Write a protein that binds this DNA or RNA. Structure first.
Ligand SMILES: Nc1nc2c(ncn2[C@H]2C[C@H](O)[C@@H](COP(=O)(O)OP(=O)(O)OP(=O)(O)O)O2)c(=O)[nH]1
Ligand SMILES: *Nc1ccc2c(c1)Cc1ccccc1-2
Ligand SMILES: [Ca+2]
Ligand SMILES: [Ca+2]
Ligand SMILES: [Ca+2]
Length: 341
DNA sequence: GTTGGATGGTAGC
DNA sequence: ACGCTACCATCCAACC
């Protein structure tokens, strides 16, 4: 079995470069008015002409400007990047029908029935990289291996404008050689739980007994890491389907006043209910982001679908429930809909 | 105590 | 990403 993972290089900035080639060779930074940094926003993506100097995703814009004060700072236009992406996914479909859209710029492909071995796979990659650049003028990185996870690590090693195959041997090498942290699904929090307890490779997970690993990172991550180290990881390429649609809005000032908050909450409903686009949810959750930036939520599932009026009415009840059960002022209010009929 | 689903949260991306 | 998925401990209703 063979998996090909495509990852679009610095996607949003790249798209902006395409929609405006004058920007090529200039440092380009795509900004978001993101969580922590509600003064000047944060870097969503930067091109390599900006990354070279350390301007990377998630750093505050106030810090970017200290590095590249003459760079181009662009508002992020997600709707544009979504279109372009979908056109690329279509191009990927013409190579394999078995595809898994992991995110706006990431897709897995099962190419087992398209190639005979890794030599031929590399060339398909080259063809794919060639097609995207041709049709969308976007450099992408291609990762090829025997499974999704390793295909992904491959692309991580070759970023940007790269291509890599991790053969069956190197897979065995990486199970012994690679830092556990660089495995997909392992972030800062989980790695601490592993680095503290002497687990730095995948192979280390075969040593430790299952229950103490379960009661530390969970049944899922445990089975997942065991499976990888044991070289038995065999997860099929499946179609992802949207499972929830939500929206969060920031208020002018922190509050606990229901009448002051209601309008922002209704804004969230209108906007997320519009997005449902013919889908009928059975669950509704209201989130509050509090003044200290902690996240709280109250939801309900119905034996039937939620009409926009039920959404309005239940929402108020859910936000009342938050207001009774949490003493903190609220900074952001939001809603999400799930369990579609 | 068990089973299925629901809840409010964690973690990663 | 102020958006989303998967997961988890716990809760809940109902129970031969
Ligand atoms: N809407 C939104 N998308 C974001 C934000 N930050 C990052 N993203 C998107 C753009 C990126 O493709 C991706 C960031 O994490 P990734 O590691 O998956 O990006 P990746 O290394 O694959 O390449 P990319 O960052 O272009 O260079 O998610 C944000 O604040 N808001
Ligand atoms: N980005 C984002 C948007 C909406 C929501 C989250 C993240 C988490 C959450 C939880 C409950 C309702 C809505 C949201
Ligand atoms: Ca990317
Ligand atoms: Ca990405
Ligand atoms: Ca990691």
């Amino acid at each position: 079995g063979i998996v090909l993972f495509v990852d679009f290089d610095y996607f949003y900035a790249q798209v902006e470069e395409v929609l405006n080639p004058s920007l090529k060779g200039k440092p380009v930074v795509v900004c978001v008015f993101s969580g922590r940094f509600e003064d000047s926003g944060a870097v969503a993506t930067a091109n390599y002409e900006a990354r070279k100097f350390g301007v990377k995703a998630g750093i505050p814009i106030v810090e970017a400007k200290k590095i590249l004060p003459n760079a181009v700072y662009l508002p992020m236009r997600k709707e544009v990047y979504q279109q372009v992406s979908s056109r690329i996914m279509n191009l990927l479909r013409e190579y394999s029908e078995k595809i898994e859209i992991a995110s706006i710029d990431e897709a897995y492909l099962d190419i087992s029935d398209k190639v005979r071995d890794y030599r031929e796979a590399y060339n398909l990659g080259l063809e794919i990289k060639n097609k995207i650049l041709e049709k969308e003028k976007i450099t992408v990185t291609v990762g090829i291996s025997k499974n999704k996870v390793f295909a992904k690590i491959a692309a991580d090693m070759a970023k940007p404008n790269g291509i890599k195959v991790i053969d069956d041997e190197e897979v065995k090498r990486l199970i012994r050689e690679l830092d556990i942290a660089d495995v997909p699904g392992i972030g800062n929090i989980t790695a601490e739980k592993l680095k503290k307890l002497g687990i730095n490779k995948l192979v280390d997970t075969l040593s430790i007994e299952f229950d103490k690993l379960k009661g530390m990172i969970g049944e899922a991550k445990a089975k997942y890491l065991i499976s990888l180290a044991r070289d038995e990881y065999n997860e099929p390429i499946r179609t992802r389907v949207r499972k929830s649609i939500g929206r969060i809005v920031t208020m002018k000032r922190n509050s606990r006043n229901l009448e002051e908050i209601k309008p922002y909450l209704f804004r969230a409903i209108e906007e997320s209910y519009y997005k449902l686009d013919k889908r009928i949810p059975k669950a509704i959750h209201v989130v509050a982001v509090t003044e200290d930036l902690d996240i709280v939520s109250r939801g309900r599932t119905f034996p039937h679908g939620i009409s926009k009026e039920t959404a309005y009415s239940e929402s108020v009840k859910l936000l009342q429930k938050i207001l009774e059960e949490d003493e903190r002022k609220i900074r952001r209010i939001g809603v999400r809909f799930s369990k579609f009929i």
